[PDB]
Amino acid sequence: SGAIYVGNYRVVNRHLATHNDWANLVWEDSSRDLLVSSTTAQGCDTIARCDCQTGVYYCSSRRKHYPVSFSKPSLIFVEASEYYPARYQSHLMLAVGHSEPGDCGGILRCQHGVVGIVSTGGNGLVGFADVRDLLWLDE
Ligand SMILES: CSc1ccccc1OC(=O)N1CCC[C@H](C(N)=O)C1
Ligand SMILES: [Zn+2]
């Protein structure tokens, strides 16, 4: 679980969005596993606008943060799950690091701010949904 709170927006994994997120929907993209909903309170986070390929992510299944080197956002095949059929997920960045399904929503940050959230993983890999291209999050 986990979200990014920026301005009057909440960014969550689309597969974990709640009834309230869908009732206050701003934008969603199943191909990216992202959903953004509106909030009444001003958010705590800031978004990186950079090309960093290293950073630190939070891993809830270890209660720890880990440093990672990750690939640039790209189209990657993701096997079927209870949430989606087998498909290509876009704007996904892979890295070597521990993750389990419940880790989705953990933030990845570089020295410039929030880069993205955990969205996929497996066998010593962890994948992050990039948010750096969503310029409208802090217009
Ligand atoms: C950190 S997720 C994870 C980690 C290890 C093993 C499996 C994991 O589950 C995934 O890769 N899934 C399940 C939830 C939806 C994901 C998606 N974005 O399509 C794909
Ligand atoms: Zn950066």
Sorted by where each begins, the domain ranges of the chain are 3-44, 45-139
Would the annotation count 112 as a binding residue? yes
The neighbour count for residue 86, using CB atoms within 10 Å, is 9
Q: What is the resolution of this structure in A?
A: 1.3
Measured CA to CA, the distance from residue 10 to residue 134 in angstroms comes to 13
Measured CA to CA, the distance from residue 34 to residue 136 in angstroms comes to 14
CB half-sphere exposure, 97, CA atoms < 13 A:
30
Cα 73 to averaged position of ligand 2 atoms, centre (Å): 14
Asked if 133 is an active-site residue, the reply is: no
Q: Which residue has the tokens 């299944």?
A: 61
Would the annotation count 44 as a binding residue? no
